Amino acid sequence: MKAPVRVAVTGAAGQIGYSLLFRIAAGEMLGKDQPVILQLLEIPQAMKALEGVVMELEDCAFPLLAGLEATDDPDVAFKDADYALLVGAAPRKAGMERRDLLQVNGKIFTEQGRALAEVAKKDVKVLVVGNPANTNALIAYKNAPGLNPRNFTAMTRLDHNRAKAQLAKKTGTGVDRIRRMTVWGNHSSIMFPDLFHAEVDGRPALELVDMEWYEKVFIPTVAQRGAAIIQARGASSAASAANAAIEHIRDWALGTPEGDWVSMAVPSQGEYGIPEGIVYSFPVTAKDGAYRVVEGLEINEFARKRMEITAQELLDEMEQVKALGLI
Amino acid sequence: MKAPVRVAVTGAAGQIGYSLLFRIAAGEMLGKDQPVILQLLEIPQAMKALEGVVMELEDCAFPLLAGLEATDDPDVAFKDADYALLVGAAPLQVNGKIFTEQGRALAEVAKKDVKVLVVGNPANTNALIAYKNAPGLNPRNFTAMTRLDHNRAKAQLAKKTGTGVDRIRRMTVWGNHSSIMFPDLFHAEVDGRPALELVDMEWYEKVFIPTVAQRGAAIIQARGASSAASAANAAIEHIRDWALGTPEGDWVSMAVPSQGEYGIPEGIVYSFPVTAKDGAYRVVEGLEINEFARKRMEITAQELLDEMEQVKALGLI
Ligand SMILES: NC(=O)C1=CN([C@@H]2O[C@H](COP(=O)(O)OP(=O)(O)OC[C@H]3O[C@@H](n4cnc5c(N)ncnc54)[C@H](O)[C@@H]3O)[C@@H](O)[C@H]2O)[C@@H](O)CC1
Ligand SMILES: NC(=O)C1=CN([C@@H]2O[C@H](COP(=O)(O)OP(=O)(O)OC[C@H]3O[C@@H](n4cnc5c(N)ncnc54)[C@H](O)[C@@H]3O)[C@@H](O)[C@H]2O)[C@@H](O)CC1
Numbered sequence A: 001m002k003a004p005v006r007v008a009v010t011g012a013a014g015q016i017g018y019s020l021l022f023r024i025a026a027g028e029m030l031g032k033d034q035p036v037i038l039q040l041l042e043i044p045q046a047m048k049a050l051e052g053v054v055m056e057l058e059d060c061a062f063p064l065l066a067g068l069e070a071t072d073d074p075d076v077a078f079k080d081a082d083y084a085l086l087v088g089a090a091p092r093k094a095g096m097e098r099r100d101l102l103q104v105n106g107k108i109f110t111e112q113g114r115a116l117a118e119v120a121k122k123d124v125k126v127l128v129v130g131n132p133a134n135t136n137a138l139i140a141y142k143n144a145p146g147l148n149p150r151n152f153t154a155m156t157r158l159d160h161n162r163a164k165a166q167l168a169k170k171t172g173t174g175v176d177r178i179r180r181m182t183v184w185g186n187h188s189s190i191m192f193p194d195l196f197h198a199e200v201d202g203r204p205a206l207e208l209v210d211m212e213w214y215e216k217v218f219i220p221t222v223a224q225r226g227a228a229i230i231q232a233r234g235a236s237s238a239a240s241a242a243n244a245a246i247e248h249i250r251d252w253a254l255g256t257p258e259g260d261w262v263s264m265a266v267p268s269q270g271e272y273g274i275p276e277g278i279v280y281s282f283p284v285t286a287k288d289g290a291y292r293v294v295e296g297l298e299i300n301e302f303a304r305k306r307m308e309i310t311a312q313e314l315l316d317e318m319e320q321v322k323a324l325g326l327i
Numbered sequence B: 001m002k003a004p005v006r007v008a009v010t011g012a013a014g015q016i017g018y019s020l021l022f023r024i025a026a027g028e029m030l031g032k033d034q035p036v037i038l039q040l041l042e043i044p045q046a047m048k049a050l051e052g053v054v055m056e057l058e059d060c061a062f063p064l065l066a067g068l069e070a071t072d073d074p075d076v077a078f079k080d081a082d083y084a085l086l087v088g089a090a091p092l093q094v095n096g097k098i099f100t101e102q103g104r105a106l107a108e109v110a111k112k113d114v115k116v117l118v119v120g121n122p123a124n125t126n127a128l129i130a131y132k133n134a135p136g137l138n139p140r141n142f143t144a145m146t147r148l149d150h151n152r153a154k155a156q157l158a159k160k161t162g163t164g165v166d167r168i169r170r171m172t173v174w175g176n177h178s179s180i181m182f183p184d185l186f187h188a189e190v191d192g193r194p195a196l197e198l199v200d201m202e203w204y205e206k207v208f209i210p211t212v213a214q215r216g217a218a219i220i221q222a223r224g225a226s227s228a229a230s231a232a233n234a235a236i237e238h239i240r241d242w243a244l245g246t247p248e249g250d251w252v253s254m255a256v257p258s259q260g261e262y263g264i265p266e267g268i269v270y271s272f273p274v275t276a277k278d279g280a281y282r283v284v285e286g287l288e289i290n291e292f293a294r295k296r297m298e299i300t301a302q303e304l305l306d307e308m309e310q311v312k313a314l315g316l317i
Helices: A015-025 A044-058 A100-118 A134-142 A155-173 A209-233 A238-254 A301-323 B015-025 B044-058 B091-109 B123-131 B149-162 B200-213 B215-223 B229-245 B290-314
Strands: A005-010 A036-042 A065-071 A085-086 A123-130 A151-155 A180-183 A191-195 A262-267 A279-287 A289-292 B003-012 B036-041 B067-071 B082-087 B115-118 B142-144 B172-175 B182-184 B251-258 B270-278 B278-284
Touching: A005 A015, A015 A044, A015 A238, A015 B015, A015 B067, A015 B229, A036 A044, A036 A301, A044 A065, A044 B215, A044 B229, A065 A151, A085 A100, A085 A238, A100 A134, A100 A301, A123 A134, A123 A238, A123 A301, A123 B251, A134 A262, A134 A279, A134 A301, A151 A279, A155 A180, A155 A191, A155 A209, A155 A262, A180 A262, A180 A301, A191 A209, A191 A301, A238 A262, A238 A279, A238 B015, A238 B044, A262 A289, A279 A301, A279 B115, B003 B015, B015 B036, B015 B044, B015 B229, B036 B044, B044 B067, B082 B091, B115 B123, B115 B229, B123 B142, B123 B251, B123 B270, B123 B290, B142 B270, B149 B182, B149 B200, B149 B229, B149 B251, B172 B251, B172 B290, B182 B200, B182 B290, B200 B215, B200 B290, B229 B251, B251 B278, B270 B290
Parallel strands: A005 A036, A005 A085, A036 A065, A085 A123, A123 A151, B003 B036, B003 B082, B036 B067, B082 B115, B115 B142
Antiparallel strands: A151 A262, A180 A191, A180 A279, A262 A279, A279 A289, B142 B251, B172 B182, B172 B270, B251 B270, B270 B278
């Protein structure tokens, strides 16, 4: 019954794409009743590897895969897209300093912002994964004249899921019984996973674990998790990041559970006093393609301190990119 | 919900393992209401990497992942196992040690009705070593994978005839996962029509067979790495279709221990057309085997017989 939706994925021959594409075509992100057409974008150097990825997608014989196309032009990839996952971003290079990374990214994200505005569905839903995700989502929406800025989001779902995994281990309860986790700010060393509103089986998180543990054990371990993986595997956490990507999209399109919320970085409308315009991770509920920030939570001083630091870091990078005339 | 099943997976820190585990834990293999306990086995030198994979699985916050354990001991990994996916193999003697030790561990500690899928190459021969060395377990519960070749062939047919992949049924790949496997278009249907009515015999033998056999190499030449995601997909489907069952009017390819079917030597692990229902499979017997098909069935049966022989020579079985 359902007509196919078009899903654009950039960075498609990369590591995250290699763990993401198969699970999307199997129907894990938008439902087992919803056929998908994948429109994959790579840079010209990666096209041959992308062709090999395309062959492996064909070799899975996915009944929901209604169409598959690979290109190196952003106007063909985003053509009529319903969803766009912007995973590609500039690589890191030797002695290539921060502003230099900002500049290169500014380039990709301006171009892609423009392309979306010209050829995608007007209500295209956009997820930016490529780092730095928050600032890249800022640059894209500001270059996508004609699209609603609230359709541009950035991922904090990996940090959210890591925080829920640690709390589950600590309190010895199934991960399916942790609710109301929040990660505020962005995917960085300074993100703030908030346990003041979380619940473990119905009980408040902070009745089961103490502040000492929270502040000197839990916080640093979530912030170090990505480094731990790299030290153990010798490669970054692609499967777990692809999984967070899928969840971020699924929960947005299909809706969040009753009584719960998820973390999403979205353009601020001054909620909790966070400056307008910046892309900032908030507690959010969704229902049918739309989300709203969860307002009214009580912020203590511990919280506010941490939320503010993260707002300031994002305000600064925004400063830099403005200074580069990127926005 | 059902009670959890223990799924053991060897070679867990490798390439297939990395594309396999998260889909299993997500409920793609046994269903969304079946929680799973993952029991992962690696060699001691890949244990560090393995702990990294464990960390990533935790970080998916999967509701159906009821437990996770990583080990370098087969007797720990296979304990009370209900399903075992044997992916790790030797980068004949060396494989032989692996498969006898693993076949023995399974017999000692796993469930009596443990279902086993051998992926590590050479898969058909490796499944023979294990079953032969797994005194006490039903040898028919030991299978090898030919589902990847099966899926590739469906893919090529769909592409040729312009039809959707979901409309191709009754593909068969006889023999093993090898350059001489035989993908049979004689009984396949494309949108209810016989395949060979839509496709000619010259394309079949000149274009189709060679292109399916070369598929793994095309991928390596393209990506610079072998086909891990699509092989993991094929392994998931092999298990799923055996555990849940095949669709009505259809069949799948699996390599199973021969019981003389189609005149194939008893004992060697050989790929046939099978239907399955709730954990048991049955060979599709009584198909018409023409002469073009027999020669090819013969060749691959021969090769398999040699290795069998060779393996006895080593006193492995
Ligand atoms: N926000 C988050 O929580 C996370 C963000 N992450 C970011 O995820 C991004 C991708 O990570 P991978 O591990 O897959 O990186 P890979 O280097 O494996 O893949 C990146 C891919 O991007 C492609 N690419 C580059 N520029 C492109 C462009 N202009 N158009 C289309 N494709 C282009 C490259 O050709 C490459 O294939 C990185 O920026 C990474 O830092 C990950 O670290 C996951 C966590
Ligand atoms: N049957 C078929 O259709 C296919 C079979 N294949 C076979 O699949 C196997 C794995 O392929 P990959 O690309 O993952 O390989 P990788 O080299 O990436 O990984 C294999 C893993 O096996 C582990 N291992 C080795 N000996 C082990 C033992 N005694 N116990 C536990 N773990 C052990 C290694 O430490 C390694 O992590 C290879 O034999 C490959 O040839 C694949 O090529 C897919 C197709």
